[PDB]
């Protein structure tokens, strides 16, 4: 950490450059050089810093993240003057408070919208269901209908969440129950219209906002989402690019996830009065909001100048409005593994093996909860307790009842992994071991794996290798080895059994 | 393997085995063919395991909700008797053999609890479980105790659990969702906590179980028993006035028992699977009625019911019973219900108590690392390599968060750090790196804790806690000998860190 | 009754062409011709007509007021033997059991379901309270969201059952005496939320069967709750009608109350055996309950013929869903007066006098036992009583309803003078003497209130209200004409105690 | 006006201490200039309402805090200002007692509560179940003694076994009572006077026995045990019976459940001297000394005031007081209590007499409990009168569907003199087509008569030989002997249709 020397960390697609120019006032009316950054992945390299202490003084992320940094401590409270507080809105200094306190500073509101090509396309669709037959006309004329990104689940969410997609829900103070609005149906509709449009050929997989943003400054798609950032530059080229309402889904408005851009100011930080007052009197400034919404457009911002000032502007005033529909996305530290599991569920699902139904039953079982410096054997929790096996004491995880010493002698012969339950190690007794050993699954284990893989595996004439029918028993034709790779079944292999569906297993009659 | 010519039947040593026995030796004279009935003890869990063999009886009586999880298990045999039989028996008690659409037992009888109280002890029945407290210490003066039934198993303590909430496993309409288990409700933990509160003020003892409390209201040393019919025929022998009645009311509602259905199953591997079928079929007011007088076999599904059966008031105060309690499901999740539920009871009964926390270990050991690894399914990924007769170097494994297919570098990884393999849906499932960063930096509750009684440290260590030195948790002092005892008088465990067992100052908030 | 024909009446909604064919049939093959007549009130009707003999042989009717048709001994009892109750499936014979023996023969299942237009409204709205949004969205289209009976309370339930809004308890309970929840707060916020939809222009309360039913046909309105009956109806107009599940209020599924069209026999008809024999080896056959259908669809019926031959329609499985989340309509006496509050209620909550938790209020008390003997002749005055049991009042003996004590003649004699009406309790008349009379006079002197808006009361006295003298009640001075017309105005009443009429002034009119 | 000023006027029940009550009150005279007197008048819990309603009536009265809710309701009832002092030195619980519609209406002074005095001599150990007293009485009657005698005349003396089994009175839910949930008619007050009408029918005791016969009897040695409060124990004390203060006994297996009384003191609304009377009652009866007066004339109980209670609690019978009442439940402050009273007292009254079964008796009483049927005008011209509005102009509301009446409905009314309905405490009628449907449902349209034979033979001048009567279903002439049979039997004929019907011996039983 450096005195005396402010750190700035911002994302990429917000203007960094215009954050330079506030911070060179700072430079010359206080004396201290300030430093404005733009690092790659700032969402997962701020916790890796932080623990170490070193890291950027301020940085500008959404709230959801946040909230798991006050959890984890890694950031400091920030204080208003009373009076200045009461100058911003109140919702934004809702979303920026976790348990209580407050956590960082309310710069900005952000929400998805619909960009379309006015030139490309003059009537905008209200609906999801027909852009398809507007991909079709357009790829003669040499253009896309829609192209955004998929690699981020933040873009693809309203279609999952406009049937459903709940993914916690409010009650009375209860926010984070362990069911998680995935698996809902309408979810699993969105998300299927989604992967429809890919296997359509409507749109493609393998989109980033790289792709999609220089498609629609290229003019070669019509519509895209995205959020105020883009806007500057697609003015750099204008493409007759207008703002709208996201497309309502089976009969529902897209539900976008509102994000509030907010600035927290590191735990460990040398500058912490000195960067608070610089945020509290040069950034909040009208002139220091317009700097950085110059590089790149900020939208709905907290500061009571706003409401009167760029308010009044067409795309930001669509952009409340896809805002007030939405929902505003919660601070709670479970919010990070919420977004890797959607985020691999919609990559997988768009790719293929993994189907819609089956991307999001993975997703609920990973944000659910996890299985997981904690001993996974018997002996090295014994050294670090200084206790001999023959006199350690262990407890059955389903009974609670004190371990024999014959019963702990077992568990490291057996070679078995050490369970964890609300942060104490436990074992198995030999009853309750036998009673849920025998519940089922025995020997259920099944190695499924592609042909394609299998190919690339051991090689050679995949005839060859013979792969007995499951029921009948018979060599597979080479026809029907071929079958599995044109249906893209996956051949299965339990023990010593590698085993395939001849043609009239393969259907049932 | 199992003999021809001779039908094996076993049966609960509750239930009367002789009666039984003298239908057979009827059979014996008219068909030619001796049958044996026997009592195994703990038949429930040695019936599914000899099935498997080949070995074991012709014909299994037990309750139908073990019988489901045999049906799923195939060790049981399809029933061929129709509408001619059917119509005969009750419609209800077929609905409860009834699994997947097809049928798989015999709807011999229905069992249901009641409470059995000592006319001439107590010459008026409670009518609330709030009434027995108070009601035990004026009958201690007389020497005598107010309630003793079975504290071992969890079916004499159910109706107490369930009365003001205990939705157990039964959820849904025509269908049952194993998600939602009602053991962690507020009724059910209202009514282990009167259990619980009637053992500590030594109304009860724990250690309680069917032979103690049938012998202390056959002898007169105990004015109320929660029993079944089975118990009728002993209590009728020895001299003591007895009468079935209402099970008392909790809270002001009404208790609710599991309604059992008395069945007879026919093992998949009979030889003489037709042969024992006719024996059940042609059930009978001769048969039933045999079995009865050895010991009572509650309401039958027949005409014999119907008519001798239904004068009888103890019988009709069973089915009163009945009606306020639920009819137990048939689905194989019963087992791993009725496990975690008994060990809830033992150790809320003493030990663990914490009845929410008893309450909560059950809810997860029911609802939803350690496994052999020559059968089953591999512990390891070496021995899943023997298996398979694929090398390390040429395997394939998918990581069970992302499902993307494991680099060769993070495949020695994995077989490195010894990771136990993880099985989802019956298919090994491996680890990435980049799963593994992000899962095991969130969720951080400390590395653990390994709590443990003062009294077991003295028994681990030898020396007492007069020896033992230990330090203050959070301001590091070291603890008064003083300090030690109120540990023990609040029975609160204390923590190793670093080795490192570990004041009043910070003791108190 | 004509001994030979056979009179059948069956409700307009339902096919009552295909009831006269499979008659027709009954007419060629056995010579005996039977006459089906579509009667309005037939619900009323029948009671009527059977107390003096006449009326249908068979009556087609929910269970609902079979139950108690057959405790006034206007239905018959009826045996079809247990073939015949093996062909049909057994909960139809529960809903037709009242008192173990059976009262009508089952004939189908019919239960409330949404309806929608696909083309004017592709996907449903899932809950109940999407329903604002969708008409405001619909209404500049020029159409409307949802229409359906107002009029009827069957068509209002389901919304009223979602959060509570129980008729009557258990079904072992069944009537727990004095349990109607229609005063619930599930009842009340069904019915404030029908209210706010009629309040929010969204609805109209003077909408009826025949108004909804024409809307949805000409694609004004895009969904409509109707039953099965209405699908030939709709079928007739091209339109892509869909059946689906009610909407959800409150996060609970909407119960529609689930009927069951039965046929009952009346005690005073000659060709009993005949009517057994239509229905039971003409109509309830898969050909006879075709020709029912075919007319107007009869949704499930009781026939096992019917499985997979009408259940592999998707209509038919949605009827269903509807009918398991809700439950199935009692078959006690008390049925039909539940049904006139819950109507009057429904019809004073969507009008004026209507604080929705008044008009269950009076639902309540309208549902459970109670009457004033305002009858005419029961006798309701001493002399007449004296009269028909043909004794003197000189010499008439009677008991105070409330201790039972024999009246004293000076007692009896006060009775008359102040012409006090006589007391029915367990169908014995009953008087009231002198001690209970002191004690139950002096319990309430909270006095007669007449309140009455400021319109109605200047048509009372035939004044103007600036005329007319009303005094604040806690003022006790002169109203002004603009205090009066404020009352007006917030539609508040005017109220006459002590034969003074009084009001809230401007000062005390805010909270002070 | 009708109220004198100057001086205090004093109501308080003649078993309770009136002579220890005007000591209390000499002193406030000597000290101060009141001249106070105490009355006991008699029935003064329905004198009350009566003299309070034209101003006069006493300044204070002293009655349980159960009939003074009622009272605050009537309005005849001042509000109770005391400091924050003097509410801490009364115990907390007599004062929630007192609080009706939230505001306190009287002073709170002691708590009763029934209990069972035993003779010690004569049953040194006392039954501890009201099933041991019909077997103790045949052994005491054999000794010349009898085992129980009390009051069976007030319901307050039987409720205890009534309310053991059942007894749901009012009940109790959210904190506020609930008036349509009455229990009188449940399975357990059924037993608690089947038990007590089998006392009286197997003689162990009698119908017609009052306060007066049981204290003398019990003061005399005549018999054993009684059920009596505090207030009685004095003359039991004059009396040389040793006696004592035991629970009351249990019935299937409860403890019988008494009412607990709070002997309160209110002011009346239309009274001047209020602020003597409240320095009356604050300041000299409330006192250590001045409860202590009211206690030697007659034991007033466990007081409210902190300090003279834990004195007295040394006494075991104000103990034995508590422990009755612990079991039991305090009485609601309601209005409705007092036709709770009457309807209870109507039935233990029949049922004992013999008239009406206690399944019927119960019944009736359950019903006389809840709703109810000068002040309103009754018949439509006294209504059309007091509002001075002709009927051709008046304006009525039916009371089903709250819809305004035609002329031609509101001149049927009147016509056919219907008795007019009230709802809510408004007026109304009935409309046609709601009299209609209403009118079909008769449930019964039986109209009966029942009348015993001998009272038949009265009413037309007729003996039963020369009256024809036929048999409900055989409908046979009945036979002279059938006739005499519902006369032993005491089975009452009935008039169904004009006509006089009375069941044959053949159709008693199953056919
Ligand atoms: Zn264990
Ligand atoms: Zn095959
Ligand atoms: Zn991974
Ligand atoms: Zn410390
Ligand atoms: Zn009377
Ligand atoms: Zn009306
Ligand atoms: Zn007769």
Redesign the interface.
């Known amino acids: 950490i450096e005195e005396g020397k402010l750190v700035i960390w911002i994302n990429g697609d917000k203007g960094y450059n215009g954050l330079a120019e506030v911070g060179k006032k700072f430079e010359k009316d206080t004396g201290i050089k300030v430093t404005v950054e733009h690092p790659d992945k700032l969402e997962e390299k701020f ?1 890796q810093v932080a623990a170490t202490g070193d890291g950027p003084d301020i940085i500008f992320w959404a709230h959801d993240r946040f909230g798991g940094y006050a959890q ?1 401590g890694l950031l400091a409270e920030i204080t208003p003057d009373k009076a200045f507080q009461d100058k911003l809105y109140p919702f934004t200094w809702d979303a920026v408070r976790y348990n209580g306190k407050l956590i960082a500073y309310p710069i900005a509101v952000e929400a998805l919208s619909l960009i379309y090509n006015k030139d490309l396309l003059p009537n905008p669709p209200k609906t999801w ?1 027909e852009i398809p037959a507007l991909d079709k006309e357009l790829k003669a004329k040499g253009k896309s209908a829609l192209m955004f990104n998929l690699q981020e689940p933040y873009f693809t969410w309203p279609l999952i969440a406009a049937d459903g997609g709940y993914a916690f829900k409010y009650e009375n103070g209860k926010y984070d129950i362990k069911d998680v609005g995935v698996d809902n149906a309408g979810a699993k509709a969105g998300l299927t219209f989604l992967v429809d449009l890919i296997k359509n050929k409507h749109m493609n997989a393998d989109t980033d906002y790289s792709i999609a943003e220089a498609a629609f400054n290229k003019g070669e798609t019509a519509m895209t989402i995205n959020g105020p950032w883009a806007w500057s530059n697609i003015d750099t080229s204008k493409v007759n690019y207008g703002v709208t309402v996201l497309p309502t889904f ?3 408005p897209s539900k976008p996830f509102v994000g509030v851009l907010s600035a927290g100011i590191n735990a460990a930080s040398p500058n912490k009065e000195l960067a608070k007052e610089f945020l509290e009197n040069y950034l909040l400034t009208d002139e220091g909001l317009e700097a950085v919404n110059k590089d790149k457009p900020l939208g709905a911002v907290a500061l009571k100048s706003y409401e009167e000032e760029l308010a009044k502007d067409p795309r930001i005033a669509a952009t409340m409005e896809n805002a007030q529909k939405g929902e505003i996305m919660p601070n709670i ?1 479970q919010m ?2 919420f977004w ?2 959607v985020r ?1 569920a919609v990559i ?1 699902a768009a790719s293929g ?2 189907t819609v139904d089956e991307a999001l039953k ?1 997703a609920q ?2 944000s659910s ?9 018997l002996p090295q ?1 014994c050294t ?4 001999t096996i023959h ?3 262990l407890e059955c995880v ?5 371990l024999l010493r014959r019963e702990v002698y077992d568990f490291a012969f ?8 609300d ?3 436990y074992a ?1 007794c030999d009853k309750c ?1 036998k ?15 592609y042909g394609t ?1 299998l190919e690339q ?2 090689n050679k004439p995949l005839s060859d290798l013979l792969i007995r029918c499951i029921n009948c028993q018979k060599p597979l034709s080479p026809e029907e080895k071929q079958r599995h790779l044109d249906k893209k079944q996956r051949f299965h ?1 339990i ?2 059994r590698w085993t395939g569906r001849c043609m009239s297993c393969s259907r049932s009659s």
Do not use: M, W
């Open positions: 916790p984890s269901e089976k009969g529902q530290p990070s593994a890797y599991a691999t997988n093996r993994q993975d079982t990973n909860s996890e299985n997981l410096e904690r001993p996974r054997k929790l670090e307790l200084q206790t006199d350690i004491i389903y009974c609670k009842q004190q057996r070679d078995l992994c050490i369970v964890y339950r942060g104490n190690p198995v071991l009673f849920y050993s025998k519940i089922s699954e025995y020997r259920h284990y099944s190695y499924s794996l893989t595996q051991y292999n023990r010593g």
